[PDB]
Design a protein around this nucleic acid. Structure first.
Ligand SMILES: [K+]
Ligand SMILES: [K+]
Ligand SMILES: [K+]
Ligand SMILES: [K+]
Ligand SMILES: [K+]
Ligand SMILES: [K+]
Ligand SMILES: [K+]
Ligand SMILES: [K+]
Ligand SMILES: [K+]
Ligand SMILES: [K+]
Ligand SMILES: [K+]
Ligand SMILES: [K+]
Ligand SMILES: [K+]
Ligand SMILES: [K+]
Ligand SMILES: [K+]
Ligand SMILES: [K+]
Ligand SMILES: [K+]
Ligand SMILES: [K+]
Ligand SMILES: [K+]
Ligand SMILES: [K+]
Ligand SMILES: [K+]
Ligand SMILES: [K+]
Ligand SMILES: [K+]
Ligand SMILES: [K+]
Ligand SMILES: [K+]
Ligand SMILES: [K+]
Ligand SMILES: [K+]
Ligand SMILES: [K+]
Ligand SMILES: [K+]
Ligand SMILES: [K+]
Ligand SMILES: [K+]
Ligand SMILES: [K+]
Ligand SMILES: [K+]
Ligand SMILES: [K+]
Ligand SMILES: [Mg+2]
Ligand SMILES: [Mg+2]
Ligand SMILES: [Mg+2]
Ligand SMILES: [Mg+2]
Ligand SMILES: [Mg+2]
Ligand SMILES: [Mg+2]
Ligand SMILES: [Mg+2]
Ligand SMILES: [Mg+2]
Ligand SMILES: [Mg+2]
Ligand SMILES: [Mg+2]
Ligand SMILES: [Mg+2]
Ligand SMILES: [Mg+2]
Ligand SMILES: [Mg+2]
Ligand SMILES: [Mg+2]
Ligand SMILES: [Mg+2]
Ligand SMILES: [Mg+2]
Ligand SMILES: [Mg+2]
Ligand SMILES: [Mg+2]
Ligand SMILES: [Mg+2]
Ligand SMILES: [Mg+2]
Ligand SMILES: [Mg+2]
Ligand SMILES: [Mg+2]
Ligand SMILES: [Mg+2]
Ligand SMILES: [Mg+2]
Ligand SMILES: [Mg+2]
Ligand SMILES: [Mg+2]
Ligand SMILES: [Mg+2]
Ligand SMILES: [Mg+2]
Ligand SMILES: [Mg+2]
Ligand SMILES: [Mg+2]
Ligand SMILES: [Mg+2]
Ligand SMILES: [Mg+2]
Ligand SMILES: [Mg+2]
Ligand SMILES: [Mg+2]
Ligand SMILES: [Mg+2]
Ligand SMILES: [Mg+2]
Ligand SMILES: [Mg+2]
Ligand SMILES: [Mg+2]
Ligand SMILES: [Mg+2]
Ligand SMILES: [Mg+2]
Ligand SMILES: [Mg+2]
Ligand SMILES: [Mg+2]
Ligand SMILES: [Mg+2]
Ligand SMILES: [Mg+2]
Ligand SMILES: [Mg+2]
Ligand SMILES: [Mg+2]
Ligand SMILES: [Mg+2]
Ligand SMILES: [Mg+2]
Ligand SMILES: [Mg+2]
Ligand SMILES: [Mg+2]
Ligand SMILES: [Mg+2]
Ligand SMILES: [Mg+2]
Ligand SMILES: [Mg+2]
Ligand SMILES: [Mg+2]
Ligand SMILES: [Mg+2]
Ligand SMILES: [Mg+2]
Ligand SMILES: [Mg+2]
Ligand SMILES: [Mg+2]
Ligand SMILES: [Mg+2]
Ligand SMILES: [Mg+2]
Ligand SMILES: [Mg+2]
Ligand SMILES: [Mg+2]
Ligand SMILES: [Mg+2]
Ligand SMILES: [Mg+2]
Ligand SMILES: [Mg+2]
Ligand SMILES: [Mg+2]
Ligand SMILES: [Mg+2]
Ligand SMILES: [Mg+2]
Ligand SMILES: [Mg+2]
Ligand SMILES: [Mg+2]
Ligand SMILES: [Mg+2]
Ligand SMILES: [Mg+2]
Ligand SMILES: [Mg+2]
Ligand SMILES: [Mg+2]
Ligand SMILES: [Mg+2]
Ligand SMILES: [Mg+2]
Ligand SMILES: [Mg+2]
Ligand SMILES: [Mg+2]
Ligand SMILES: [Mg+2]
Ligand SMILES: [Mg+2]
Ligand SMILES: [Mg+2]
Ligand SMILES: [Mg+2]
Ligand SMILES: [Mg+2]
Ligand SMILES: [Mg+2]
Ligand SMILES: [Mg+2]
Ligand SMILES: [Mg+2]
Ligand SMILES: [Mg+2]
Ligand SMILES: [Mg+2]
Ligand SMILES: [Mg+2]
Ligand SMILES: [Mg+2]
Ligand SMILES: [Mg+2]
Ligand SMILES: [Mg+2]
Ligand SMILES: [Mg+2]
Ligand SMILES: [Mg+2]
Ligand SMILES: [Mg+2]
Ligand SMILES: [Mg+2]
Lengths: 132, 254
RNA sequence: GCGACCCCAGGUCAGGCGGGAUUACCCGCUGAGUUUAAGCAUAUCAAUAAGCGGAGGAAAAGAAACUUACAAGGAUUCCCCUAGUAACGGCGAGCGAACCGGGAACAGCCCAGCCUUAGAAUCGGGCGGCUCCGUCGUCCGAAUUGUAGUCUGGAGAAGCGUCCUCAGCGGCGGACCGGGCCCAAGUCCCCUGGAAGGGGGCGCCGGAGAGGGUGAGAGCCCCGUCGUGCCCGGACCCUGUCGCACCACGAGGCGCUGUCUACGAGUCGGGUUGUUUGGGAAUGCAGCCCAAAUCGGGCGGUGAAUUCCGUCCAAGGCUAAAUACUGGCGAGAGACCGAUAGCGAACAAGUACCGCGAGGGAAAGAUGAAAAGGACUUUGAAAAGAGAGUCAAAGAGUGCUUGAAAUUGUCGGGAGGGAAGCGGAUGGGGGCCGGCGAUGCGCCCCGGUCGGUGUGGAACGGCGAGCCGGUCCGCCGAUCG
RNA sequence: CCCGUCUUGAAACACGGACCAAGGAGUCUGACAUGUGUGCGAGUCAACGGGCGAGUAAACCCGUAAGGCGUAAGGAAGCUGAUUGGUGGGAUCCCCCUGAGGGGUGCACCGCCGACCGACCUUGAUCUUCUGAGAAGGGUUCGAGUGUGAGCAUACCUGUCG
RNA sequence: GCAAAUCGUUCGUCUGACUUGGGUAUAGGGGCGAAAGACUAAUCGAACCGUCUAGUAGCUGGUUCCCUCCGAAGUUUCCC
RNA sequence: GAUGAGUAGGAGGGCGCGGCGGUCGCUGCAAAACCUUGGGCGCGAGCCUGGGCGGAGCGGCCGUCGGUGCAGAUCUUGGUGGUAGUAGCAAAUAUUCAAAUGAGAACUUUGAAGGCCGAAGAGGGGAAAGGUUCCAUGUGAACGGCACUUGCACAUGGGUUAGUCGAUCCUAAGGGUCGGGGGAACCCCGACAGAUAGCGCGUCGCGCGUACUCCGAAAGGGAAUCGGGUUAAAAUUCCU
RNA sequence: UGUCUACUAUCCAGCGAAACCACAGCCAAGGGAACGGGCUUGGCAGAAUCAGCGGGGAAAGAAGACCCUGUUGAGCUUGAC
RNA sequence: AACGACUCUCGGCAACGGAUAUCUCGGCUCUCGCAUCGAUGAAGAACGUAGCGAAAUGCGAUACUUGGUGUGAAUUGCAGAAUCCCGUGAACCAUCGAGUCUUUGAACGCAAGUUGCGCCCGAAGCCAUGGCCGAGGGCACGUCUGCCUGGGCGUCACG
């Protein structure tokens, strides 16, 4: 049960806040779990998906497929993964959108900001979860 | 606990509609004036009219609340407390107390010191109350009907009620995450939790301190309560409810 | 003629102020009728709607010219009660307060007048400096037709002595309000399925089983949720603590003192008229007429004179809190509505459209998990059809979820000499129904299988220490069921 | 003979109705009343508010000379204010007797008649502060009175009224 | 109906109290009227728009499921 | 054991719809809704079930609650019939031939013929009013009450050139106002209660000086443009 | 009374409404809310369809404007209040 | 009185229509917090503004945005971009303190069915103190304080 007076339990408000969220907010909402190998390495559970990350699909008809992210289509709440495509009636190839919660990040596109973000995520877990 | 609901006072009357009168081969209902729109000439103001005003519109000053006399409320609580000590009534209300060692179920005061939900569940297993708590979790389901979209998404069966007698006890937060399990302080017992659905026989787990306070709070048949000024437990119209003993007694059968 | 003052005029003179908008609540004015009275005119609707103005986060009210008649209360406001009461009313219909009492909150004050006259001690503006919501210097003005001090009836002035009280800023922290960041636990095995988020199995978190998202009922996939920790900012108010400074000249408090002791005018009040009120020989308000007083004045719910008594001090002013809030901005919630409902408006709705104009004012939501939105072949001028393709599904094909009725076509059955339908009773022809309709039972032996009085244990029971029992295991006997 | 409807009278040459879907009309609230359920009972009521509390619009607790209704009425008012039951029927129970019987018991309710309080009238020994007190004794008068309380809260139907 | 006043033929007047455009003045118990209660935007013996207003109606119409039980009155008195 | 009519009206026991507090269940191995010449239960309101469709929710039971049950109201909104391929297409004299174009021609275009408007026109312009209808090209549908290859429709693009034509300036009936006078105020009167506006001449001074430097005419008054030529569409405006 | 011309009607291609509609549509008498398409008793009665017609459908159009009632108005008048 | 047509009727399928069921970034009701429009030009109205837009939303000739800060890699219907990536850094992102903010409107030079009719100041530039040119701004009413210039025998005083 929630106790914060500033937090609403209304279904209507929750859905509106989700589907009208700005692009910066949609980035956090479009997070994916790290692989068991990366979780033990960085001590981090979830990360927002990035364009150059490598992920593996763990749900859906493309379960088991692995590839590199090529487009984070935030407006459509999906990501496009290299080689994860289907053929149209005319034979053309189109990428299939996949929700980031249904994939696992196998390799991270590290950078100056990404590494700093990993430290902050691990800092809280190393203290609020273990030292307590 | 009800919140008032009512339609808007101006609903169905934001119109200058007037009756055409008779002599035009149509009913005398008021109608929207003007033209150039489908709305023109349509009926208005009538409870039988599309877009009109409902009959007897609901008002906020409906009498929502009720004040039952205090002595009757105390009578209801005492009956509910007494019903919780009868295993037949507790079973009849749907509680699974087949492994409960005894009713009333009184446990050591050390349970009030439990801080972790994992330890709280182990306490329920030891005293045999876990099966009733497990029933509540397995009954978790979505509410049928329109209630599910009214912020009343989920329903479930009631679990055990735990009564404690120490203010600020830490078990209030160790047990609260368990579905179906309610926690209440002995000094402020609530009828809605003692007889949910207006049905007697709630499964109650008493702490030792809470159990020992019942005499002081509710008094006895001889002396009055210490915290309910001038209150005495009600008497029944029948001292012995066992008809078989009365009917089959030597005095009657002679 | 030259000067001072007075009144007035001009200025794109220097620097300021005002208008309009908004409607939920608030203040002032103005002001109906429908209606009720079973007609109707007083009344009632209503001191309301409409009309015209003025404000704020609240407004308004407010420190008694009060209540009361008691053993007295003590600014205002608000709630409960007083009370549907006293009273008012074609005493009809109806209408209708207040004090006491219990609570919320709580706060008190500022002027005018006799009182600097050894000093207008006051204020504004120009210019300059500084530690700049201010302060200091200087200059020019305002002002004696009176600025500032002192005083406000609770008092007070003056004198006397008791020897009591009174003089700032800064540093840090807390409290208060706002924001930001990290942080629990499965996506393990089997089955179904287009998809597992479903079922079954095995685990885990829980101060987190609020809520939402994700291809079906997801605590453990994602965002959040619980609880800490860390960081940033706003208010300058309140509060804790520290450092520095800390002149009682004066002023106040207390006590006494012969004396003094100034308090609001065309206002109060009265007559009259109108209106209003529960206010009735007149509740308030307003017009006109009259027009005060200072050991006095107002009030004391029946007009008047006389004698007392109680009570307060109008005609000047300010003031937080308790209270109100269908507007604005932000937030939470619901036994509310679910696209003819709910706001008129779930959508490019006060929109399209109508009216010269004031105004009037709709209809209109749902493919799929994903466009994967139908390549290509063939017929046709084209629309399009046929086949094929995508999809779990086109029996989801861009107003496409589901797809009822009225009504229509077609195929099949049947009937029909100016209605048809309908009740009851059979028949013909259809359609439908195997719980629509059974096949067991008893006694024999052949075989097979499975258990059997008396003593030992195990866990219990009925009746109330003791009697009375069954169940299960084992061992003998018995040798049947 | 076509339904619905007003009507003494409808198949009517009385009115509404071409057909289908969906919408569509005794409700909410204040006052009062009878009845019934429930709690307590000469009391009853947590109602403004306060203390709190499911981290909480609930529940729980609080009436200390509060307040409402009831506990006493009559009178315009000044005022005064219940001396506390008799009898005919009658439920139940007890005794005798075994009859349409006889005794004891006599609730509820009804009939009848006194008494008491008050308005009005009447009455006055004995006292007193001269207008009061009250020994005795009253009444074809009047009252929404008394003669060992029955109310208060709450729920709902029905009815009157706004 | 071509038309919420039109069409055909036939008719009145035609240098005048003549016809007509634009500008301008008069607004609802008001205007304007060589006067018909005419006209005042298809509205006139009191326009149009919004509001008071869900105005009131002793009068008309309607008033939504099933069985079961009981079961009327059109008569009295008073009443613009 | 007796007994059974019922309008207006009363009451009882039941049926059904949507929530809430409880409780017991169902569902992608197919919920709700809907369809059925499947079957059954109840006097009845209704209920249970087979099959089909549909593809994600739903039900029983106890209590409790309500915007809770329709054939009617010249009821409301929406939809749909018979009427009916019916009434109807008829004023303004009128068309015909050949060829071209086109899938398609009584209706488009060219040519020829025969008619009409007959200068108070069915011709050539403009003011109001409209606002792109103007011009070119193209065109699936819709629309142009038959049809169309067509266009005042639809799509794309193009087009309006001024010292001399107007507005602009002036004043008319009148309108809007200062001051003043009224008015609770919105507003009323309108140069009528008043230190006007300023102008002229010298170079800041003299002189003059009667309370509006306002609005009000694309037909009143009024400074100045003429031929010739030019575009798919403009001209007294472009060119000379 | 006859006859002549044009445009309709008429027939065709194309296009294509509305009023109205309880259910419907052959009569005589009877009874009946006293004037029936339906009821009673008779006469009778044979698919589908075209052009006309105005007897009937007490045909349609409109909650009678006449008259009366209502404790409804409104315009106007006066010796009504 | 067959067959067939027609009419009616029953069933299957196909139409017509949008009821029902399940939904919902909306409505309605209750409660809470806050106090913030304008001559420093508001509310409202108009016009304009994007590589491809009409509307809605946004914005003002710096015109679906500039700047700062935060966030840390998109926007997306298409096109294009050695724009951008261990970063002075993507975004139709968030936020706000810098900055821009056309014509109007209480609306203020006068007007208005007019982009009509006036007056004043004036940077920059330029031709020989003057002249042209000109960015930009100013000129309403009422009123307060102060000030300047004046009027009247209004009341005086002195020549
Ligand atoms: K100074
Ligand atoms: K979920
Ligand atoms: K004084
Ligand atoms: K008066
Ligand atoms: K006095
Ligand atoms: K609507
Ligand atoms: K489908
Ligand atoms: K009727
Ligand atoms: K009738
Ligand atoms: K009829
Ligand atoms: K009491
Ligand atoms: K109390
Ligand atoms: K009396
Ligand atoms: K003529
Ligand atoms: K009028
Ligand atoms: K009547
Ligand atoms: K349930
Ligand atoms: K069925
Ligand atoms: K229910
Ligand atoms: K023109
Ligand atoms: K010109
Ligand atoms: K002109
Ligand atoms: K002239
Ligand atoms: K020329
Ligand atoms: K034809
Ligand atoms: K007859
Ligand atoms: K009239
Ligand atoms: K057939
Ligand atoms: K059929
Ligand atoms: K629906
Ligand atoms: K502006
Ligand atoms: K725009
Ligand atoms: K920015
Ligand atoms: K002008
Ligand atoms: Mg009709
Ligand atoms: Mg409505
Ligand atoms: Mg449902
Ligand atoms: Mg100035
Ligand atoms: Mg009346
Ligand atoms: Mg009446
Ligand atoms: Mg009347
Ligand atoms: Mg008003
Ligand atoms: Mg104002
Ligand atoms: Mg304000
Ligand atoms: Mg306040
Ligand atoms: Mg104030
Ligand atoms: Mg005072
Ligand atoms: Mg007071
Ligand atoms: Mg009372
Ligand atoms: Mg009144
Ligand atoms: Mg008080
Ligand atoms: Mg002074
Ligand atoms: Mg002093
Ligand atoms: Mg003194
Ligand atoms: Mg998580
Ligand atoms: Mg599992
Ligand atoms: Mg699904
Ligand atoms: Mg937290
Ligand atoms: Mg005074
Ligand atoms: Mg007076
Ligand atoms: Mg008045
Ligand atoms: Mg004040
Ligand atoms: Mg508010
Ligand atoms: Mg709607
Ligand atoms: Mg619905
Ligand atoms: Mg679906
Ligand atoms: Mg469909
Ligand atoms: Mg059908
Ligand atoms: Mg009759
Ligand atoms: Mg009938
Ligand atoms: Mg007849
Ligand atoms: Mg009638
Ligand atoms: Mg009819
Ligand atoms: Mg319905
Ligand atoms: Mg009762
Ligand atoms: Mg009391
Ligand atoms: Mg007396
Ligand atoms: Mg007496
Ligand atoms: Mg014609
Ligand atoms: Mg007038
Ligand atoms: Mg005339
Ligand atoms: Mg006449
Ligand atoms: Mg009107
Ligand atoms: Mg009378
Ligand atoms: Mg019967
Ligand atoms: Mg249901
Ligand atoms: Mg059928
Ligand atoms: Mg059911
Ligand atoms: Mg409801
Ligand atoms: Mg209803
Ligand atoms: Mg219906
Ligand atoms: Mg009916
Ligand atoms: Mg109808
Ligand atoms: Mg209709
Ligand atoms: Mg039709
Ligand atoms: Mg025809
Ligand atoms: Mg014709
Ligand atoms: Mg012809
Ligand atoms: Mg012709
Ligand atoms: Mg032709
Ligand atoms: Mg001719
Ligand atoms: Mg000719
Ligand atoms: Mg001529
Ligand atoms: Mg056509
Ligand atoms: Mg053209
Ligand atoms: Mg066009
Ligand atoms: Mg000219
Ligand atoms: Mg003039
Ligand atoms: Mg004016
Ligand atoms: Mg003036
Ligand atoms: Mg003059
Ligand atoms: Mg001029
Ligand atoms: Mg002019
Ligand atoms: Mg001219
Ligand atoms: Mg031209
Ligand atoms: Mg006949
Ligand atoms: Mg007939
Ligand atoms: Mg016959
Ligand atoms: Mg025939
Ligand atoms: Mg006829
Ligand atoms: Mg005819
Ligand atoms: Mg008829
Ligand atoms: Mg009539
Ligand atoms: Mg009529
Ligand atoms: Mg009437
Ligand atoms: Mg009468
Ligand atoms: Mg009248
Ligand atoms: Mg935008
Ligand atoms: Mg202006
Ligand atoms: Mg302009």
């Amino acid at each position: 049960m929630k106790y914060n007076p500033r937090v609403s339990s209304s279904r209507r408000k929750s859905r509106k806040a989700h589907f009208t969220a700005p692009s910066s907010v949609r980035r956090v909402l479009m997070s994916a779990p790290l692989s068991s190998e990366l979780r033990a390495k960085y001590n981090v559970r979830s990360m927002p998906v990035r364009k150059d990350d490598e992920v593996q699909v763990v749900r859906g008809t493309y379960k088991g497929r692995e590839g590199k992210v090529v487009q984070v289509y935030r407006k459509k709440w999906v990501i496009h993964i290299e080689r994860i495509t289907r053929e149209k009636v005319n034979g053309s190839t189109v990428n299939v959108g996949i929700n980031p919660s249904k994939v696992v990040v196998s390799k991270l596109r590290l950078d100056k900001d990404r590494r700093s973000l990993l430290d902050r995520k691990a800092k809280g877990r190393a203290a609020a979860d273990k030292d307590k | 606990a009800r919140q008032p609901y009512a339609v808007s006072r101006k609903a169905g009357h934001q119109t200058s509609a007037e009756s055409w009168g008779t002599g035009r081969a149509v009913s005398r209902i008021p109608r929207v004036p003007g033209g150039g729109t489908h709305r023109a000439g349509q009926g208005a103001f009538g409870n039988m009219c599309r877009g009109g005003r409902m009959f007897a519109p609901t008002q906020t000053w409906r009498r929502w609340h009720r004040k039952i006399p205090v002595n009757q409320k105390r009578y209801a609580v005492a009956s509910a407390i007494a019903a919780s000590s009868v295993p037949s009534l507790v079973l009849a209300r749907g509680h699974r107390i087949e492994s409960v060692p005894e009713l009333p179920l009184v446990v050591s005061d050390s349970v009030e010191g439990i801080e972790k939900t994992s330890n709280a569940i182990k306490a329920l297993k030891q005293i045999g109350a876990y099966p009733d708590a497990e029933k509540a979790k397995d009954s978790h389901a979505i509410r049928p009907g329109k209630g599910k979209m009214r912020n009343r998404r989920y329903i479930s069966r009631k679990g055990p009620l735990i009564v404690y007698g120490t203010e600020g006890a830490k078990l209030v937060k160790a047990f609260r995450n368990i579905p179906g399990v309610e926690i209440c302080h002995v000094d402020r017992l609530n009828l809605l939790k003692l007889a949910p659905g207006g049905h007697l026989g709630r499964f109650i787990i008493w702490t030792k301190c809470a159990y020992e306070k019942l005499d002081a709070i509710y008094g006895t048949f001889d002396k009055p309560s210490q915290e309910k000024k001038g209150y005495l437990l009600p008497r029944p119209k029948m001292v012995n409810a066992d008809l078989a003993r009365i009917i089959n007694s030597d005095e009657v059968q002679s």
